[PDB]
Amino acid sequence: MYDVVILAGGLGTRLKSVSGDIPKPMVDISGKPFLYRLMEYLEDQGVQRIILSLSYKADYIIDSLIKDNPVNSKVDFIIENEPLGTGGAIKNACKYIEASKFIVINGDTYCELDYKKFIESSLDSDLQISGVEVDDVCRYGSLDIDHDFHVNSIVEKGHQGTGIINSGTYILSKKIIEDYPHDKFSFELDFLPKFTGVFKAFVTKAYFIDIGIPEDYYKACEKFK
């Protein structure tokens, strides 16, 4: 089981048009912050080490975890003092991973994935993304993949109908991004169009919610009581 990096920076504070002040990962979900429920699930899956990449209000979040540690998994913090982007944050996290591969997850996403099966589908790739099959992919970014599940492109939200949600969860070999020439960049908009290695999707029908979507936010609160 790999180390997990959770990207909690650069997620902004809005809900649609409405701008907020609470770091999206700390939104209360029926008695517990969203980030805590995510970490509890990871611990249940066997995660032994979590790396929290933080930008906006890192201290508030740190203070929180000290006060209440929802998990016994090893937890490390990384305060980004300038916006590195999603790619820059992953590159920056590489220094702390000693193994050759690790997991990245967005901190405003909750997906009840089978991580042991995810790790196994990734053995013959240098980059693997988790995709979630749904009936209506309308509200979500989606994946355009071929009949061998090679990822051809990451598709912006807006397309209606059946589809595979871009979960933002990856398994990657550190070597592909560790020495990326830029310190600040977007993983999906800057890195992926350049990446020439084997890039496949692990596709499931896992429970998935994105807390930046109002309907999933209500769903989550109801789910958890």
Check: CB of residue 105 under 8 Å from CB of residue 7: yes
Q: How far apart are CA 150 and CA 176, in angstroms?
A: 17
How far apart CA 106 and CA 59 sit, in angstroms, is 19
The CA distance from 78 to 51, in Å, is 7
- Look at the block and give the residue holding tokens 């609470």: 22
Q: Nearest-CA neighbor of 110 among 40, 186, 204?
A: 40
The CA distance from 144 to 50, in Å, is: 30
Cited resolution, angstroms: 2.0
CA distance 8 to 11: 7
Two structure tokens written together for 55: 């930008």
The HSE-up count of residue 23 (CA atoms within 13 Å, CB side) is 23
CA distance 7 to 25: 9
- 172: buried, middle or exposed (CB in 10 Å: 19+, 13-18, 0-12)? buried
Measured in whole angstroms, how far is the alpha carbon of residue 26 from the centre of its chain?
15
103, 3 contact by CB (below 8 A): yes
Task: Single out the residue of 164, 113, 166, 108 nearest to residue 136, CA to CA.
Answer: 164
By what technique were these coordinates determined?
X-ray
Question: Longest C-alpha distance within the chain, in Å?
Answer: 48
The residue numbers preceding gaps of C to N over 2.5 A in the chain are: none
As a three-state string, the secondary structure of the chain is: CCCEEEECCCCCCEECCEECCCCHHHCEECCEEHHHHHHHHHHHHCCCEEEEEECCCHHHHHHHHHHCCCCCCEEEEEECCCCCHHHHHHHHHHHHCCCCEEEEEECCEEECCCHHHHHHHCCCCCEEEEEEEECCCCCCCEEEECCCCEEEEEECCCCCCCEEEEEEEEEEEHHHCCCCCCCCCCHHHHHCCCCCCCEEEEEECCCEEECCCHHHHHHHHHHCC
Q: How many residues comprise the chain?
A: 225
